[PDB]
Design a protein around this motif. Structure first.
Motif, PDB file in Angstrom:
ATOM      1  N   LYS B 229       0.827  -1.209   0.000  1.00 26.06           N
ATOM      2  CA  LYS B 229       0.000   0.000   0.000  1.00 26.06           C
ATOM      3  C   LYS B 229       0.860   1.257   0.000  1.00 26.06           C
ATOM      4  CE  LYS B 229      -3.987  -2.166   2.265  1.00 26.06           C
ATOM      5  NZ  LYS B 229      -4.918  -2.168   3.428  1.00 26.06           N
ATOM      6  N   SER B 230       1.886   1.279   0.849  1.00 25.94           N
ATOM      7  CA  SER B 230       2.794   2.414   0.914  1.00 25.94           C
ATOM      8  C   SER B 230       3.542   2.597  -0.394  1.00 25.94           C
ATOM      9  CB  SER B 230       3.774   2.209   2.065  1.00 25.94           C
ATOM     10  OG  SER B 230       4.430   0.962   1.929  1.00 25.94           O
ATOM     11  N   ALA B 231       4.016   1.496  -0.972  1.00 27.99           N
ATOM     12  CA  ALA B 231       4.736   1.558  -2.236  1.00 27.99           C
ATOM     13  C   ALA B 231       3.835   2.057  -3.354  1.00 27.99           C
ATOM     14  CB  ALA B 231       5.304   0.182  -2.567  1.00 27.99           C
ATOM     15  N   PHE B 232       2.545   1.732  -3.285  1.00 27.32           N
ATOM     16  CA  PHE B 232       1.593   2.189  -4.290  1.00 27.32           C
ATOM     17  C   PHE B 232       1.313   3.683  -4.147  1.00 27.32           C
ATOM     18  CE2 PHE B 232      -2.748   2.611  -5.970  1.00 27.32           C
ATOM     19  CZ  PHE B 232      -2.552   2.119  -7.234  1.00 27.32           C
ATOM     20  N   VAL B 233       1.227   4.180  -2.909  1.00 22.94           N
ATOM     21  CA  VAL B 233       1.091   5.625  -2.713  1.00 22.94           C
ATOM     22  C   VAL B 233       2.341   6.346  -3.200  1.00 22.94           C
ATOM     23  CG1 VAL B 233       0.922   7.421  -0.961  1.00 22.94           C
ATOM     24  CG2 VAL B 233      -0.635   5.512  -0.915  1.00 22.94           C
ATOM     25  N   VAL B 234       3.517   5.790  -2.908  1.00 25.34           N
ATOM     26  CA  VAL B 234       4.765   6.367  -3.403  1.00 25.34           C
ATOM     27  C   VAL B 234       4.781   6.375  -4.924  1.00 25.34           C
ATOM     28  CG1 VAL B 234       7.234   5.949  -3.572  1.00 25.34           C
ATOM     29  CG2 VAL B 234       6.135   5.942  -1.362  1.00 25.34           C
ATOM     30  N   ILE B 298       8.815  -0.559  -7.469  1.00 24.35           N
ATOM     31  CA  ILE B 298       8.225   0.772  -7.622  1.00 24.35           C
ATOM     32  C   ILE B 298       8.664   1.408  -8.931  1.00 24.35           C
ATOM     33  CG2 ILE B 298       7.940   3.048  -6.605  1.00 24.35           C
ATOM     34  CD1 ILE B 298       8.419   1.910  -3.916  1.00 24.35           C
ATOM     35  N   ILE B 299       9.945   1.299  -9.267  1.00 29.35           N
ATOM     36  CA  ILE B 299      10.490   2.034 -10.401  1.00 29.35           C
ATOM     37  C   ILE B 299      10.117   1.374 -11.727  1.00 29.35           C
ATOM     38  CG2 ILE B 299      12.664   2.714 -11.470  1.00 29.35           C
ATOM     39  CD1 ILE B 299      13.598   2.943  -8.395  1.00 29.35           C
TER      40      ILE B 299
END
Ligand SMILES: CC(C)CCC[C@@H](C)[C@H]1CC[C@H]2[C@@H]3CC=C4C[C@@H](OC(=O)CCC(=O)O)CC[C@]4(C)[C@H]3CC[C@]12C
Ligand SMILES: CC(C)CCC[C@@H](C)[C@H]1CC[C@H]2[C@@H]3CC=C4C[C@@H](OC(=O)CCC(=O)O)CC[C@]4(C)[C@H]3CC[C@]12C
Lengths: 541, 541
Positions: B229-234, B298-299
């Motif tokens: 979830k955090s990685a998706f917001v990032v 993420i990238i």
């Protein structure tokens, strides 16, 4: 004709092939990685290029007599190589051979190499000639390839199903079906691609040229194998079929079958037919051969060798063919311009060959020590030709100086072909004199001669002929008395055939066409470094 | 501006990306094979394109205020994402994150995607804008990338050597060194490429465009991973930095820093600056991230999502930005032309989504059965928009008929966003009424309304607003009462944000810009199928 565009075009296209070769040989792209470029090229970039050009094609402007005549030239080479293979090959492989050998001799690298070269030569003067690549190549596949597939299926078997498999392998080819689809959509769309689909097809099609030449380079890496003697003779005969018999038949069939009113247009059409024949074998033949594991070494080697050998044959042929459409003064400038181009590519190839021979320290080992003297001499002739192109107008002493450089080195290359075959003979049987005789004797011959090719005229061609004759006798006698070392023998053989062409051309001049004979002499004299690069510039040193 | 060329250009470039995606996902080209195209693209085709354009570049015509201002916009986004990452990320990864996250937010797919799109838009009107891709992208690499490499080296460590490694990774990049070499050879060759080397560089450079877009497609296959979830917001915040904050800052910096005399040229320059910002993240960032195994999910995900999301943002933005340079009648034709393009790409994407939902038999399973009703409704609005573009001039009864089709389906898509979130709520908690309410109620609302967007004016926008409001409340309440199913939630979330944009735009119209608000409504109304395709058209069904 825009024949001056041909050397830029060849340098582009074969330089992209050289980039693929450098990249694959340096393992920038491995053989597994190369398949991605191949699948892009053959399954997206080429079918898009085919579809675009086929949809845009104004069939009412297509010269069907040109198509017919190229196609009949290809069909006759197919029958010739097919019946010759069936007569000559052993029963246990004659049907596989008589399938793939004629496809080799007739199917042609028209898209990757033909189209950039034809676009270069003809987009200004004869842009309709670009149509006939897209016509001939796929119609040629449709007609000729199923026969070779039928022959492979017949080898596998040894009727309706065999023929159906042949035709299906042909219809399965993206060249064949995207040309059928492009013809269908030529009639559907009425020769306009919808603008949205147009620049999609543009993006893919435009990407084909460079990626296909580069992929060809990647496919060339390591495919020249050490063939058997018989397989090597077969390879020579198949490449002769593709690069000599087929283009001669193309030019002949056009001159038999075209009836176009303008003699200028007819001349250009049969000249085009010749260059169309000289295109190398399509990599698709080797893809077929490797995939069905048939005759792989001959067909892969021959595809690579056909690619490399087609470059000089295309350049030399196209220039020869334009000499009838030229006048003696621009014709002289043309052959110095030709020779400057040949000496540039030769000098670049020779500098690389010398760098390899030297940095590998092979220049310390026989026969390579004497071969390095030959490569030094060839480098001095390519230096000398570039220097002469500048000095040809200038004052007398400079002309003499550069002439001494150029003819001492040139005669030295002849002597060194002899002395390399003597080196191989002296190595077969259980160096200072050889280096003095490789240079000093041919240098002293320039003094005999003083005491570009006709500056000293009849004496020049006499000394040249005598030096070539002595080289041929020295080399022939030493190779027969003999009968890594194999590569030296092959270099010596190619050079001996070139020295024979050169000797006979100089003799025939001495008995008489002058500038055409001088151009074929100049082609050997300054392009011999390309041969030396082919055999010793690309080895695993 | 040639804004009408943008949809052909996007369809070309993203259609080649779609070809790469189809090819890689169908295993026509495997991930190992794809590296061959990547190594060709990045090590031969791109450096040739760079070198050619850099050697040809007339630096005296370069608008340094444009370069400066794009570069300062990028540098400010770099500082912002860098300092925000250093403040917000955990110490054990904040330096690797503060290196790669700002490079993500600023480094841009200018060569593969930017140049075809800028060439399309501007080669006719403003061909000098094509220079600034070649200026900005490499100068941007030279300035900004070493800082992120320095930050990665600092994470590895946690001074002169750390800085040297950063600068060396940058100088090692073929973009950076072939631009330095091309600048050096701009001064050596004085802005002429030698003709022999010219069409060599042409062949390689021309091959870049298609092969790079296709390779991008191949790199996209399977890179959208299931992030935390955090990685998706990032990820959202990094893509917002690239596609919203950076182009806004580019347009702002140009409007601060350019002083060019013509207000028309200034307007086009800042509009260009916006589109330059909206280019997606360079695949090179993901190549760096995978190679150094940093923050890969993420990238890589963000590079793929940035690519897909940049296509509509580019189209929508470029059209918005040309509405100030348009007059109300061609402006109306423009938004129907826009809507026709959006409904074509949406309809094609929706037909594919429906084919997948149906042939997978997922249309039999909850929630996908109701999702298939949403995809049917979205297909009927994209049919209806194409039909309306023809019927908009025609007789009254035909206009009514197509309006009933179009608004029943449109209101149905709103109801179905609500009813999908209710479906997820009813699936979270331990169909005939839902299908009648998903269609019949929004169909009956068209009768209420009879009892394109202003044919029934204030009542039309009122019913539309009310339907959107009910959909937002239905969906928000059901998603919070709930708080494969994750993909449905994400589709519902994206659609709820779109319904909120649509609701507020319709309300703001009702309080008043009309055609711009109607265009943003039309973008959701007819392009919502693109969202549904993004989430359910590309799944492993
Ligand atoms: C025109 C002439 C061409 C047509 C066929 C060519 C030959 C076909 C095949 C080969 C094998 C190949 O030999 C190698 O060096 C390998 C290249 C030279 C040679 C003799 C070619 C030399 C030039 C030839 C005679
Ligand atoms: C202009 C607007 C753009 C700028 C950033 C975009 C967002 C950045 C990232 C994502 C994640 C991504 O979500 C997925 O479906 C995955 C695409 C939508 C979204 C919310 C984008 C929606 C459209 C936004 C708000």
């Amino acid at each position: 004709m825009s024949i001056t565009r041909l050397f830029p075009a060849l340098l582009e296209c074969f330089g992209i092939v050289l980039c693929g070769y450098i990249a694959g040989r340096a393992n920038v792209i491995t053989s597994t990685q190369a398949k991605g470029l191949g699948n892009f090229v053959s399954r997206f970039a080429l079918p898009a290029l085919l579809f675009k050009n086929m949809v845009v094609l104004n069939f009412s402007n297509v010269d069907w007599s040109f198509l017919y005549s190229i196609l009949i030239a290809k069909a006759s080479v197919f029958f010739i190589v097919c019946v010759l293979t069936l007569l000559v090959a052993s029963p246990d492989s004659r049907f596989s051979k008589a399938g793939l050998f004629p496809i080799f001799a007739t199917q042609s690298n028209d898209f990757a190499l033909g189209y950039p070269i034809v676009e270069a030569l003809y987009q200004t003067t004869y842009p309709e000639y670009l149509q006939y690549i897209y016509l001939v190549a796929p119609i040629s596949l449709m007609m000729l390839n199923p026969i070779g597939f039928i022959f492979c299926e017949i080898q596998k078997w040894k009727k309706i199903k065999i023929v159906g498999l042949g035709l299906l392998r042909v219809l399965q080819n993206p060249i064949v079906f995207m040309v059928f689809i492009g013809i269908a959509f030529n009639f559907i769309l009425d020769r306009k691609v919808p603008v949205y689909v147009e620049n999609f097809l543009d993006g893919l099609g435009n990407s084909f040229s460079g990626s296909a030449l580069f992929y060809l380079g990647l496919t060339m890496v390591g495919k020249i194998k050490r063939l058997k003697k018989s397989a090597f003779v077969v390879l020579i005969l198949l490449i002769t079929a593709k690069l000599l018999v087929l283009p001669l038949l193309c030019r002949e069939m056009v001159e038999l079958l075209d009836k176009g009113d303008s003699v200028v247009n007819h001349t250009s059409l049969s000249n085009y037919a010749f260059l169309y024949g000289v295109f190398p074998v399509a990599p698709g033949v080797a893809i077929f051969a490797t995939q069905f594991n048939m005759e792989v070494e001959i067909i892969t080697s021959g595809m690579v060798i056909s690619t490399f050998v087609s470059a000089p044959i295309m350049y030399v042929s196209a220039w020869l063919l334009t000499f009838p459409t030229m006048d003696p003064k621009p014709l002289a400038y043309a052959i110095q311009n030709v020779s400057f181009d040949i000496s540039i590519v030769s000098l670049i190839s020779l500098i690389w060959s010398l760098a390899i021979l030297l940095l590998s320290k092979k220049y310390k080992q026989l026969p390579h020590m004497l071969t390095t003297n030959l490569l030094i001499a060839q480098s001095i002739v390519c230096a000398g030709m570039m220097i002469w192109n500048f000095v040809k107008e200038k004052n007398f002493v400079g002309q003499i100086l550069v002439f001494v450089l150029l003819y001492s080195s040139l005669y030295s290359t002849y002597l060194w072909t002899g002395l390399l075959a003597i080196s191989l003979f002296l190595l077969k049987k259980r160096v200072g004199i050889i280096i003095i005789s490789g240079w000093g004797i041919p240098a002293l011959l320039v003094g005999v001669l003083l005491i570009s090719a006709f500056f000293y005229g009849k004496e020049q061609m006499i000394t040249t002929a005598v030096t070539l004759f002595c080289s041929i006798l020295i080399a022939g006698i030493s190779l027969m008395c003999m009968n890594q070392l194999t590569r030296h023998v092959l270099l010596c053989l190619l050079l001996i055939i070139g020295l024979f062409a050169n000797l006979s051309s100089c003799l025939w001049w001495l008995f008489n066409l002058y500038v055409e004979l001088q151009f074929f002499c100049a082609v050997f004299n300054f392009g011999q470094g390309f041969i030396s690069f082919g055999i010793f510039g690309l080895d695993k040193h």
